[PDB]
Design a protein around this ligand. Structure first.
Ligand SMILES: Nc1cccc(OCc2ccccc2)c1
Ligand SMILES: [Zn+2]
Length: 140
């Protein structure tokens, strides 16, 4: 589980988004596993605007922060899960790391701020849904 709180936006995994997130929907993209919803309160998370390929992510199934190398966001084939059929997920960054289903929402951070959230796992790899291309998260 997990979210980014930037401005009056909540960024979650589309597959973990609640009634209220859907009731307050701003933008959603099945192919990226992202849902942004509106919030009353103002968030403090700064989104990274950069091309960093190193970072730390939080893994609830280990209660551990792991430094990682990750790929640039790409169209990555992701096996069938309890939430999506086997398909290509867009804007996905892979690293060598531990990621179970309930690790989704774990933040990946570089020195610039939030890079994205855990979205995929399996085969000793963790997938991060990039949010750094979403410029509008920082305004309006
Ligand atoms: N590379 C880097 C530099 C500075 C901070 C940073 O934050 C890591 C982190 C903090 C809290 C939750 C999850 C991850 C990563
Ligand atoms: Zn960065």
């Amino acid at each position: 589980s997990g979210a980014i709180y930037v401005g009056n936006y909540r960024v979650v995994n589309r597959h973990l988004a609640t009634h209220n997130d859907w009731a307050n929907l701003v933008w959603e993209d099945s192919s990226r596993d992202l849902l942004v919803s509106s919030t009353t309160a103002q968030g403090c998370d700064t989104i990274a605007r950069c091309d960093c390929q190193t970072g730390v992510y939080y893994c609830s199934s280990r209660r551990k922060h792991y430094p990682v190398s990750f790929s640039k966001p790409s169209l990555i084939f992701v096996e069938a899960s309890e939430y999506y059929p086997a398909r290509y997920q867009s804007h996905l960054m892979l690293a060598v790391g531990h990621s179970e289903p309930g690790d989704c929402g774990g933040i990946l951070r570089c020195q610039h701020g939030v890079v994205g959230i855990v979205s995929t796992g399996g085969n000793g790899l963790v997938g991060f849904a990039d949010v750094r291309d979403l410029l509008w998260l920082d305004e309006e």
